[PDB]
Scaffold this active site. Structure first.
Site, short mmCIF file in Angstrom:
data_model
loop_
_atom_site.label_atom_id
_atom_site.label_comp_id
_atom_site.label_asym_id
_atom_site.label_seq_id
_atom_site.Cartn_x
_atom_site.Cartn_y
_atom_site.Cartn_z
N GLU A 214 0.78 -1.25 0.00
CA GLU A 214 0.00 0.00 0.00
C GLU A 214 0.80 1.28 0.00
O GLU A 214 0.37 2.26 -0.62
CB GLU A 214 -1.01 0.04 1.17
CG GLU A 214 -2.07 -1.06 1.14
CD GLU A 214 -2.96 -1.16 -0.09
OE1 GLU A 214 -3.07 -0.16 -0.84
OE2 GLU A 214 -3.55 -2.24 -0.31
N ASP A 223 -6.26 6.99 -6.16
CA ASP A 223 -5.65 5.67 -6.34
C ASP A 223 -5.60 5.29 -7.86
O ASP A 223 -5.95 6.11 -8.72
CB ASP A 223 -6.41 4.61 -5.50
CG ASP A 223 -7.80 4.21 -5.97
OD1 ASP A 223 -8.22 4.67 -7.06
OD2 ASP A 223 -8.46 3.43 -5.26
#
Ligand SMILES: Cc1cc(OCCCS(C)(=O)=O)cc(C)c1-c1cccc(COc2cc3c(cn2)[C@H]2[C@@H](C3)[C@@H]2C(=O)O)c1
Ligand SMILES: CCCCCCCC/C=C/CCCCCCCC(=O)OC[C@H](O)CO
Ligand SMILES: CCCCCCCC/C=C\CCCCCCCC(=O)OC[C@H](O)CO
Ligand SMILES: CCCCCCCC/C=C\CCCCCCCC(=O)OC[C@H](O)CO
Ligand SMILES: CCCCCCCC/C=C\CCCCCCCC(=O)OC[C@H](O)CO
Ligand SMILES: CCCCCCCC/C=C\CCCCCCCC(=O)OC[C@H](O)CO
Ligand code: NA
Length: 437
Positions: A214, A223
């Site tokens: 992550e 994202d």
């Protein structure tokens, strides 16, 4: 009985190769010792110097082999050859065990002391050998006859350096030192190797694994799919609104953040996200039985999937989940490789899938994991050289002490394998080339 030319050749090949290899290992270990003093570097330097000393004694043993065991050199060279050949033969095992233990402890639990341990190894080997030789060797303190120190003369015109020494005197000396400096270091090395393997298996978790996958961002970002995200892969919202994202951010932290947070806040949000993923598994009929049947490392790969796709999205992989509960690792992997998840994030998916295949942290090659892999290789490599090179020599010492009726061929073979530690030791300690960095 090995022909003299073969014996000469085997000693010459170990000397020709051992001289550059140990010059390169000493260089490598000295560089590391000067840049940043570490116990491993000190043990490697001592083993390098020791093996180089053994290397330089090999031509003398080579000519002795060509003279069929007789000493064809000046008699005064016998005590010098005695210490140059036998002190390193016994000390090396001590330095390998020390190095293996320094590597294991340094990696499973992440200077001046190591010099003391080396001085102690050298003091023991030199006092043990020195006392037995000085007192009991032919021409020694107890000897009253006109005899050169370390030289026996079984027949006229045939002086023998050390090898014709009375077994009643040499035997217990060889046996006791073999127990202390070979068999004890062998057990220590075998213990550190197993410890390294275990530290790799249980030394990491879901928190560390998700940090690699992550990453970390203190400000709101979009994202891969374009969704407002923050921290350690924390999805704020799917909505096409930054105000909605800031609104969700503020409610999650309990502060007017204005799209920017602290590492502690991101870490606390990440912990809540991992517990949520764990809660989602345990409350799911298709996820809980799979999770319960899995080992610690595979449970982490399952939490990693739920954290990225949600409990419902993961529950849809009915074939892989059944496979995982059945412990059919390669069949589950082959099913997961055909997913949209694999097509969209192949690097992340390959890492998680490999974790399901192996049950190891190998796909997550972090600094800590690599240090543990390095430690395992050194301890495994040390074990191999201990068993193959000085191992047959120390087993011969034990065999002759318990069964002195054995002929001298076993000791002769063990001395040749012992000499070859000058080739295998610099190759296993990892200080050749760029170093163990
Ligand atoms: C005690 C001593 C005296 C000496 O010289 C003093 C006499 C000189 S004079 C005659 O001019 O007074 C020279 C040395 C290197 C040493 C000396 C010091 C430390 C270690 C050694 C080497 O000792 C040994 C002992 C054994 C071996 C080899 N070297 C063989 C046996 C047991 C071992 C084995 O087979 O594994 C020898
Ligand atoms: C040092 C490697 C050389 C080994 C000899 C190979 C020749 C074999 C013939 C020997 C009979 C003649 C005796 C030769 C003695 C020469 C002197 C010598 O070798 O000294 C050792 C050196 O000083 C260490 O400290
Ligand atoms: C007095 C000191 C003991 C030396 C006398 C022993 C007699 C020889 C027997 C076994 C040698 C094996 C040596 C094993 C030593 C372990 C070294 C070690 O693990 O050092 C850690 C390092 O200092 C931090 O990372
Ligand atoms: C930690 C392990 C260290 C083990 C050290 C054990 C040394 C055994 C001594 C034998 C002398 C007996 C010789 C007398 C028989 C002739
Ligand atoms: C363990 C280390 C030393 C124990 C000493 C025990 C030595 C026993 C030897 C008895 C013998 O070899 O006689
Ligand atoms: C019997 C000799 C021992 C053989 C072991 C030497 C090989 C080292 C392997 C390490 C595996 C670490 C990667 C997982
Ligand atoms: Na599937």
């Amino acid at each position: 009985d090995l022909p003299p030319q073969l014996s000469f050749g085997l000693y010459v090949a170990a000397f020709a190769l051992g001289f550059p290899l140990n010059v390169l290992a000493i260089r490598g270990a000295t560089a590391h010792a000067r840049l940043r003093l570490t116990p491993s570097a000190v043990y490697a330097l001592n083993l390098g110097c020791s093996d180089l000393l053994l290397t330089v004694s090999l031509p003398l043993k080579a000519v002795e082999a060509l003279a069929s065991g007789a000493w064809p050199l000046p008699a005064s060279l016998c005590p010098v050859f005695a210490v140059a050949h036998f002190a390193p033969l016994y000390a090396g095992g001590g330095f390998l065990a020390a190095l293996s233990a320094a590597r294991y402890l340094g990696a499973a639990f992440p200077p001046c002391y190591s010099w003391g341990v080396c001085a102690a190894i050298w003091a023991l080997v030199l006092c043990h050998l020195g006392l037995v030789f000085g007192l009991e060797a032919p021409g020694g303190w107890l000897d009253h006859s006109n005899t050169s120190l370390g030289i026996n003369t079984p027949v006229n015109g045939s002086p023998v350096c050390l090898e014709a020494w009375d077994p009643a005197s040499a035997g217990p000396a060889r046996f006791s030192l073999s127990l202390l400096l070979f068999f004890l270091p062998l057990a220590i090395t075998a213990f550190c190797f197993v410890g390294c393997l275990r530290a790799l298996a249980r030394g990491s978790n879901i928190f560390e694994m998700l940090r690699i996958d992550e990453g970390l961002r203190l400000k709101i970002y979009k994202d891969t799919e374009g969704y407002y995200t923050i921290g350690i892969g924390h999805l704020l919202t799917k909505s096409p609104s930054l105000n909605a994202a800031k609104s969700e951010l503020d409610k999650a932290i309990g502060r007017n953040t204005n799209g920017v947070i602290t590492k502690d806040e991101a870490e606390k949000l990440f912990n809540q996200d991992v517990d949520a993923a764990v809660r989602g598994i345990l409350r799911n009929a298709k996820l809980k039985p799979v999770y319960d049947s899995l080992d610690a490392v595979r449970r982490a790969a399952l939490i990693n999937m739920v954290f990225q796709m949600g409990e419902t999205g993961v529950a849809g992989f009915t074939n892989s989940l059944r496979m995982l509960q059945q412990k059919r690792w390669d069949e589950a992997a082959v099913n997961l490789a055909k997913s949209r998840w694999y097509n969209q994030t192949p690097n992340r998916a390959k890492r998680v899938i490999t974790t399901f295949r192996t049950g190891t942290w190998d796909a997550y090659g972090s600094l800590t994991h690599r240090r543990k892999l390095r430690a395992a290789w050194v301890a495994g490599g040390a074990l191999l050289t201990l068993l193959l090179c000085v191992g047959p020599y120390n087993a011969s010492n034990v065999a002759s002490f318990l069964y002195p009726n054995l002929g001298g061929s076993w000791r002769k073979l063990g001395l040749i394998t012992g000499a070859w530690s000058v080739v295998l030791n610099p190759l296993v300690t990892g200080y050749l080339g760029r170093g163990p960095g």
